[PDB]
Amino acid sequence: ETITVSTPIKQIFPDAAFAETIKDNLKKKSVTDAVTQNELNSIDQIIANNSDIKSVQGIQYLPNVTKLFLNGNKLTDIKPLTNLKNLGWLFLDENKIKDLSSLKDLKKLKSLSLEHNGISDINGLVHLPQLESLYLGNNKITDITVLSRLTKLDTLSLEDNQISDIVPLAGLTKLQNLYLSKNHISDLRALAGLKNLDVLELFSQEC
Ligand SMILES: [Ca+2]
């Protein structure tokens, strides 16, 4: 939503680490400083990797954010991201995010990264058919059936998982970069129809 009157940063953003992030972003002197909706509207990018952030509550007041770098934090719930319709790049590596339902309405999201999140079920990704790059390395994924719906992908990383069947990748003609090392792949027939592959990693398969 939005704030109708000047309000302290710490009152909008409960997480102290995230409040500090917003304070630096808006170039304020203290998280106790008051900010307006106009100022929150000016934010189109948040760079907060390894910032010890546990919650991004309050981010719902930043309608124009398009880039969100939140790698290496302590995130679990990303419900606050649900209505950030303009999100184009979302990096959430090294967190513990498993509920991907909050991404369903991010129809402009083009790049999504969720490596090292202990994820196994990615069926929620079906709602992101426009996705162009996807990084899901170092998780516990085995079933990638859903990926057949992401026909716009040109870059996909599924390295260090537990995948055996990659037939779902067969129809992803736009794939240029595919990372599948450290999995359980034996059958490579699914790669017969891929004409645009430039990068392909299949080493260290444990069958
Ligand atoms: Ca600072």
PDB file of C-alpha atoms and ligand atoms in Angstrom:
ATOM      1  CA  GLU A   1       0.000   0.000   0.000  1.00  0.00           C
ATOM      2  CA  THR A   2       1.196   3.536   0.764  1.00  0.00           C
ATOM      3  CA  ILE A   3       1.817   5.898   3.660  1.00  0.00           C
ATOM      4  CA  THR A   4      -0.318   9.050   3.745  1.00  0.00           C
ATOM      5  CA  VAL A   5       1.915  10.979   6.100  1.00  0.00           C
ATOM      6  CA  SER A   6       5.595  11.310   6.957  1.00  0.00           C
ATOM      7  CA  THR A   7       6.600   8.203   8.933  1.00  0.00           C
ATOM      8  CA  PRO A   8       9.807   6.934  10.598  1.00  0.00           C
ATOM      9  CA  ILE A   9      11.694   4.340   8.553  1.00  0.00           C
ATOM     10  CA  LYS A  10      11.780   1.988  11.539  1.00  0.00           C
ATOM     11  CA  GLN A  11       7.968   2.023  11.699  1.00  0.00           C
ATOM     12  CA  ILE A  12       7.536   0.886   8.099  1.00  0.00           C
ATOM     13  CA  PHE A  13      10.423  -1.574   8.041  1.00  0.00           C
ATOM     14  CA  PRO A  14      10.380  -3.700  11.279  1.00  0.00           C
ATOM     15  CA  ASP A  15      13.592  -5.534  10.456  1.00  0.00           C
ATOM     16  CA  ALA A  16      16.473  -3.413  11.772  1.00  0.00           C
ATOM     17  CA  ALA A  17      18.863  -4.600   9.069  1.00  0.00           C
ATOM     18  CA  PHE A  18      16.350  -3.850   6.339  1.00  0.00           C
ATOM     19  CA  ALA A  19      15.549  -0.440   7.830  1.00  0.00           C
ATOM     20  CA  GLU A  20      19.256   0.356   7.674  1.00  0.00           C
ATOM     21  CA  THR A  21      19.184  -0.724   4.004  1.00  0.00           C
ATOM     22  CA  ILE A  22      16.315   1.648   3.244  1.00  0.00           C
ATOM     23  CA  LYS A  23      18.065   4.427   5.170  1.00  0.00           C
ATOM     24  CA  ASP A  24      21.206   4.040   3.059  1.00  0.00           C
ATOM     25  CA  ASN A  25      19.164   3.793  -0.121  1.00  0.00           C
ATOM     26  CA  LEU A  26      17.371   7.081   0.522  1.00  0.00           C
ATOM     27  CA  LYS A  27      20.598   8.621   1.842  1.00  0.00           C
ATOM     28  CA  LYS A  28      19.016   9.460   5.211  1.00  0.00           C
ATOM     29  CA  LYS A  29      20.999   9.898   8.419  1.00  0.00           C
ATOM     30  CA  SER A  30      18.982   7.599  10.686  1.00  0.00           C
ATOM     31  CA  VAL A  31      16.371   4.838  10.604  1.00  0.00           C
ATOM     32  CA  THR A  32      14.459   7.100  12.981  1.00  0.00           C
ATOM     33  CA  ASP A  33      14.211   9.727  10.224  1.00  0.00           C
ATOM     34  CA  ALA A  34      10.796  10.198   8.660  1.00  0.00           C
ATOM     35  CA  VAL A  35      10.197   9.409   4.978  1.00  0.00           C
ATOM     36  CA  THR A  36       7.289  10.063   2.621  1.00  0.00           C
ATOM     37  CA  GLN A  37       5.538   7.917   0.022  1.00  0.00           C
ATOM     38  CA  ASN A  38       7.174  10.150  -2.633  1.00  0.00           C
ATOM     39  CA  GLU A  39      10.576   9.062  -1.362  1.00  0.00           C
ATOM     40  CA  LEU A  40       9.511   5.407  -1.222  1.00  0.00           C
ATOM     41  CA  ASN A  41       8.253   5.782  -4.795  1.00  0.00           C
ATOM     42  CA  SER A  42      11.755   6.809  -5.906  1.00  0.00           C
ATOM     43  CA  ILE A  43      13.196   3.391  -5.034  1.00  0.00           C
ATOM     44  CA  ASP A  44      13.627   1.144  -8.040  1.00  0.00           C
ATOM     45  CA  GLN A  45      16.541  -0.848  -6.728  1.00  0.00           C
ATOM     46  CA  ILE A  46      17.598  -2.500  -3.473  1.00  0.00           C
ATOM     47  CA  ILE A  47      21.113  -3.868  -3.042  1.00  0.00           C
ATOM     48  CA  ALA A  48      21.242  -5.740   0.245  1.00  0.00           C
ATOM     49  CA  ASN A  49      23.284  -8.908  -0.155  1.00  0.00           C
ATOM     50  CA  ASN A  50      24.561 -10.524   3.044  1.00  0.00           C
ATOM     51  CA  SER A  51      22.833  -7.929   5.210  1.00  0.00           C
ATOM     52  CA  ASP A  52      21.493 -10.192   7.942  1.00  0.00           C
ATOM     53  CA  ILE A  53      17.920  -9.429   6.881  1.00  0.00           C
ATOM     54  CA  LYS A  54      15.207 -11.692   8.283  1.00  0.00           C
ATOM     55  CA  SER A  55      12.117  -9.898   6.990  1.00  0.00           C
ATOM     56  CA  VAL A  56      11.394  -7.510   4.120  1.00  0.00           C
ATOM     57  CA  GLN A  57       8.125  -6.357   5.683  1.00  0.00           C
ATOM     58  CA  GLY A  58       7.491  -2.811   4.518  1.00  0.00           C
ATOM     59  CA  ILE A  59       8.808  -3.445   1.019  1.00  0.00           C
ATOM     60  CA  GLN A  60       5.142  -3.486  -0.068  1.00  0.00           C
ATOM     61  CA  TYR A  61       5.358   0.329  -0.011  1.00  0.00           C
ATOM     62  CA  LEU A  62       7.917   0.423  -2.842  1.00  0.00           C
ATOM     63  CA  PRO A  63       5.737   0.091  -5.961  1.00  0.00           C
ATOM     64  CA  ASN A  64       8.555   0.900  -8.393  1.00  0.00           C
ATOM     65  CA  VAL A  65      11.217  -1.606  -7.346  1.00  0.00           C
ATOM     66  CA  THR A  66      12.503  -3.524 -10.373  1.00  0.00           C
ATOM     67  CA  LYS A  67      15.762  -4.963  -9.018  1.00  0.00           C
ATOM     68  CA  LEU A  68      16.102  -6.724  -5.694  1.00  0.00           C
ATOM     69  CA  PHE A  69      19.441  -8.190  -4.601  1.00  0.00           C
ATOM     70  CA  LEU A  70      18.921 -10.097  -1.361  1.00  0.00           C
ATOM     71  CA  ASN A  71      21.457 -12.918  -1.610  1.00  0.00           C
ATOM     72  CA  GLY A  72      22.862 -14.292   1.644  1.00  0.00           C
ATOM     73  CA  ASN A  73      20.283 -13.178   4.196  1.00  0.00           C
ATOM     74  CA  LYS A  74      17.902 -14.948   6.596  1.00  0.00           C
ATOM     75  CA  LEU A  75      14.713 -14.791   4.562  1.00  0.00           C
ATOM     76  CA  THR A  76      11.975 -17.388   4.810  1.00  0.00           C
ATOM     77  CA  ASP A  77       8.769 -15.537   3.972  1.00  0.00           C
ATOM     78  CA  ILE A  78       8.579 -13.427   0.798  1.00  0.00           C
ATOM     79  CA  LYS A  79       4.851 -12.687   0.921  1.00  0.00           C
ATOM     80  CA  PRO A  80       5.739  -8.950   1.077  1.00  0.00           C
ATOM     81  CA  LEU A  81       6.884  -9.239  -2.583  1.00  0.00           C
ATOM     82  CA  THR A  82       3.508 -10.404  -3.902  1.00  0.00           C
ATOM     83  CA  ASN A  83       2.372  -7.086  -5.382  1.00  0.00           C
ATOM     84  CA  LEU A  84       5.696  -5.673  -6.599  1.00  0.00           C
ATOM     85  CA  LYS A  85       4.407  -5.949 -10.154  1.00  0.00           C
ATOM     86  CA  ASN A  86       7.405  -4.227 -11.705  1.00  0.00           C
ATOM     87  CA  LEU A  87       9.985  -6.641 -10.332  1.00  0.00           C
ATOM     88  CA  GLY A  88      12.306  -7.649 -13.161  1.00  0.00           C
ATOM     89  CA  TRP A  89      15.339  -9.100 -11.374  1.00  0.00           C
ATOM     90  CA  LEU A  90      15.054 -11.011  -8.106  1.00  0.00           C
ATOM     91  CA  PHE A  91      18.097 -12.581  -6.455  1.00  0.00           C
ATOM     92  CA  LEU A  92      17.439 -14.598  -3.298  1.00  0.00           C
ATOM     93  CA  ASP A  93      20.347 -17.081  -3.119  1.00  0.00           C
ATOM     94  CA  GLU A  94      21.464 -18.311   0.313  1.00  0.00           C
ATOM     95  CA  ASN A  95      18.152 -17.907   2.134  1.00  0.00           C
ATOM     96  CA  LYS A  96      15.559 -20.443   3.258  1.00  0.00           C
ATOM     97  CA  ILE A  97      12.702 -19.641   0.920  1.00  0.00           C
ATOM     98  CA  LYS A  98      10.419 -22.498  -0.121  1.00  0.00           C
ATOM     99  CA  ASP A  99       6.966 -20.927  -0.548  1.00  0.00           C
ATOM    100  CA  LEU A 100       7.098 -19.638  -4.120  1.00  0.00           C
ATOM    101  CA  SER A 101       3.400 -18.740  -4.242  1.00  0.00           C
ATOM    102  CA  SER A 102       4.258 -15.090  -3.615  1.00  0.00           C
ATOM    103  CA  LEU A 103       5.894 -14.935  -7.062  1.00  0.00           C
ATOM    104  CA  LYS A 104       2.743 -15.864  -9.023  1.00  0.00           C
ATOM    105  CA  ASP A 105       1.778 -12.302  -9.960  1.00  0.00           C
ATOM    106  CA  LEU A 106       5.266 -11.090 -10.883  1.00  0.00           C
ATOM    107  CA  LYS A 107       4.559 -11.171 -14.625  1.00  0.00           C
ATOM    108  CA  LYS A 108       7.461  -8.876 -15.493  1.00  0.00           C
ATOM    109  CA  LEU A 109      10.068 -10.923 -13.614  1.00  0.00           C
ATOM    110  CA  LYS A 110      12.744 -11.935 -16.130  1.00  0.00           C
ATOM    111  CA  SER A 111      15.559 -13.220 -13.928  1.00  0.00           C
ATOM    112  CA  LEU A 112      15.068 -15.211 -10.735  1.00  0.00           C
ATOM    113  CA  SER A 113      17.755 -16.716  -8.533  1.00  0.00           C
ATOM    114  CA  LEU A 114      17.052 -19.090  -5.654  1.00  0.00           C
ATOM    115  CA  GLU A 115      20.226 -21.122  -5.226  1.00  0.00           C
ATOM    116  CA  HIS A 116      21.046 -22.601  -1.814  1.00  0.00           C
ATOM    117  CA  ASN A 117      17.518 -22.297  -0.390  1.00  0.00           C
ATOM    118  CA  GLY A 118      16.870 -25.982   0.336  1.00  0.00           C
ATOM    119  CA  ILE A 119      14.144 -26.049  -2.307  1.00  0.00           C
ATOM    120  CA  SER A 120      12.759 -29.280  -3.739  1.00  0.00           C
ATOM    121  CA  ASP A 121       9.337 -28.273  -5.075  1.00  0.00           C
ATOM    122  CA  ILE A 122       9.357 -25.666  -7.850  1.00  0.00           C
ATOM    123  CA  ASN A 123       5.888 -26.225  -9.284  1.00  0.00           C
ATOM    124  CA  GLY A 124       5.066 -22.684  -8.239  1.00  0.00           C
ATOM    125  CA  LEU A 125       7.261 -21.490 -11.116  1.00  0.00           C
ATOM    126  CA  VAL A 126       4.542 -22.339 -13.624  1.00  0.00           C
ATOM    127  CA  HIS A 127       3.157 -18.827 -13.070  1.00  0.00           C
ATOM    128  CA  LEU A 128       6.321 -17.237 -14.514  1.00  0.00           C
ATOM    129  CA  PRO A 129       6.162 -18.195 -18.221  1.00  0.00           C
ATOM    130  CA  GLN A 130       8.073 -15.044 -19.207  1.00  0.00           C
ATOM    131  CA  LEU A 131      11.179 -15.965 -17.186  1.00  0.00           C
ATOM    132  CA  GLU A 132      14.407 -15.629 -19.210  1.00  0.00           C
ATOM    133  CA  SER A 133      17.087 -16.669 -16.707  1.00  0.00           C
ATOM    134  CA  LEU A 134      16.634 -19.015 -13.762  1.00  0.00           C
ATOM    135  CA  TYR A 135      19.198 -20.122 -11.188  1.00  0.00           C
ATOM    136  CA  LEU A 136      18.206 -23.020  -8.924  1.00  0.00           C
ATOM    137  CA  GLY A 137      21.597 -24.517  -8.208  1.00  0.00           C
ATOM    138  CA  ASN A 138      22.468 -26.262  -4.969  1.00  0.00           C
ATOM    139  CA  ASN A 139      18.983 -27.265  -3.889  1.00  0.00           C
ATOM    140  CA  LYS A 140      17.154 -30.589  -3.570  1.00  0.00           C
ATOM    141  CA  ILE A 141      15.146 -30.610  -6.789  1.00  0.00           C
ATOM    142  CA  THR A 142      14.415 -33.924  -8.540  1.00  0.00           C
ATOM    143  CA  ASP A 143      11.268 -33.166 -10.535  1.00  0.00           C
ATOM    144  CA  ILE A 144      11.594 -30.377 -13.119  1.00  0.00           C
ATOM    145  CA  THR A 145       8.403 -31.150 -15.029  1.00  0.00           C
ATOM    146  CA  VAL A 146       7.234 -27.560 -14.551  1.00  0.00           C
ATOM    147  CA  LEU A 147      10.167 -26.162 -16.561  1.00  0.00           C
ATOM    148  CA  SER A 148       8.573 -27.247 -19.854  1.00  0.00           C
ATOM    149  CA  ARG A 149       6.218 -24.287 -19.347  1.00  0.00           C
ATOM    150  CA  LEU A 150       9.118 -21.801 -19.187  1.00  0.00           C
ATOM    151  CA  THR A 151       9.667 -21.662 -22.931  1.00  0.00           C
ATOM    152  CA  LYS A 152      11.320 -18.214 -22.786  1.00  0.00           C
ATOM    153  CA  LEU A 153      14.360 -19.446 -20.827  1.00  0.00           C
ATOM    154  CA  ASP A 154      17.764 -18.820 -22.416  1.00  0.00           C
ATOM    155  CA  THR A 155      19.748 -19.375 -19.229  1.00  0.00           C
ATOM    156  CA  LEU A 156      19.062 -22.146 -16.737  1.00  0.00           C
ATOM    157  CA  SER A 157      21.120 -23.486 -13.865  1.00  0.00           C
ATOM    158  CA  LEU A 158      20.089 -26.670 -12.092  1.00  0.00           C
ATOM    159  CA  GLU A 159      23.556 -27.741 -10.963  1.00  0.00           C
ATOM    160  CA  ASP A 160      24.048 -29.595  -7.689  1.00  0.00           C
ATOM    161  CA  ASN A 161      20.553 -31.052  -7.314  1.00  0.00           C
ATOM    162  CA  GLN A 162      19.065 -34.558  -7.655  1.00  0.00           C
ATOM    163  CA  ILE A 163      17.706 -34.510 -11.186  1.00  0.00           C
ATOM    164  CA  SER A 164      17.674 -37.626 -13.372  1.00  0.00           C
ATOM    165  CA  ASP A 165      15.091 -36.804 -16.013  1.00  0.00           C
ATOM    166  CA  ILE A 166      15.700 -33.734 -18.165  1.00  0.00           C
ATOM    167  CA  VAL A 167      13.118 -34.534 -20.843  1.00  0.00           C
ATOM    168  CA  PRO A 168      11.167 -31.462 -19.614  1.00  0.00           C
ATOM    169  CA  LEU A 169      13.960 -29.335 -21.114  1.00  0.00           C
ATOM    170  CA  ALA A 170      13.477 -30.817 -24.580  1.00  0.00           C
ATOM    171  CA  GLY A 171      11.168 -28.082 -25.831  1.00  0.00           C
ATOM    172  CA  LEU A 172      13.095 -25.108 -24.463  1.00  0.00           C
ATOM    173  CA  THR A 173      14.524 -24.061 -27.836  1.00  0.00           C
ATOM    174  CA  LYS A 174      15.794 -20.718 -26.541  1.00  0.00           C
ATOM    175  CA  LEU A 175      18.261 -22.297 -24.101  1.00  0.00           C
ATOM    176  CA  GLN A 176      21.766 -20.938 -24.643  1.00  0.00           C
ATOM    177  CA  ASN A 177      23.284 -21.596 -21.225  1.00  0.00           C
ATOM    178  CA  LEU A 178      22.509 -24.804 -19.374  1.00  0.00           C
ATOM    179  CA  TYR A 179      24.204 -25.904 -16.160  1.00  0.00           C
ATOM    180  CA  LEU A 180      23.444 -29.444 -15.035  1.00  0.00           C
ATOM    181  CA  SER A 181      26.636 -30.631 -13.363  1.00  0.00           C
ATOM    182  CA  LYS A 182      26.426 -32.599 -10.112  1.00  0.00           C
ATOM    183  CA  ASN A 183      23.112 -34.388 -10.703  1.00  0.00           C
ATOM    184  CA  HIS A 184      22.012 -37.910 -11.717  1.00  0.00           C
ATOM    185  CA  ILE A 185      21.674 -37.560 -15.493  1.00  0.00           C
ATOM    186  CA  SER A 186      22.349 -40.455 -17.893  1.00  0.00           C
ATOM    187  CA  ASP A 187      20.006 -39.825 -20.809  1.00  0.00           C
ATOM    188  CA  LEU A 188      20.942 -36.789 -22.900  1.00  0.00           C
ATOM    189  CA  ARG A 189      18.454 -37.300 -25.746  1.00  0.00           C
ATOM    190  CA  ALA A 190      16.510 -34.268 -24.486  1.00  0.00           C
ATOM    191  CA  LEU A 191      19.370 -32.161 -25.868  1.00  0.00           C
ATOM    192  CA  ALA A 192      18.871 -33.273 -29.487  1.00  0.00           C
ATOM    193  CA  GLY A 193      16.482 -30.449 -30.347  1.00  0.00           C
ATOM    194  CA  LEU A 194      18.398 -27.616 -28.681  1.00  0.00           C
ATOM    195  CA  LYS A 195      19.991 -25.566 -31.460  1.00  0.00           C
ATOM    196  CA  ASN A 196      21.087 -22.455 -29.563  1.00  0.00           C
ATOM    197  CA  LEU A 197      23.161 -23.963 -26.749  1.00  0.00           C
ATOM    198  CA  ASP A 198      26.448 -22.082 -26.261  1.00  0.00           C
ATOM    199  CA  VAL A 199      27.254 -23.221 -22.716  1.00  0.00           C
ATOM    200  CA  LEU A 200      26.479 -26.701 -21.381  1.00  0.00           C
ATOM    201  CA  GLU A 201      27.868 -28.327 -18.243  1.00  0.00           C
ATOM    202  CA  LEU A 202      27.142 -32.002 -17.573  1.00  0.00           C
ATOM    203  CA  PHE A 203      30.212 -33.115 -15.613  1.00  0.00           C
ATOM    204  CA  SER A 204      30.152 -34.948 -12.281  1.00  0.00           C
ATOM    205  CA  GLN A 205      26.939 -36.909 -12.824  1.00  0.00           C
ATOM    206  CA  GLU A 206      26.372 -39.568 -10.165  1.00  0.00           C
ATOM    207  CA  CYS A 207      24.424 -42.448 -11.683  1.00  0.00           C
TER     208      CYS A 207
HETATM  209 CA    CA B   1      25.067   2.048   6.349  1.00  0.00          CA
END
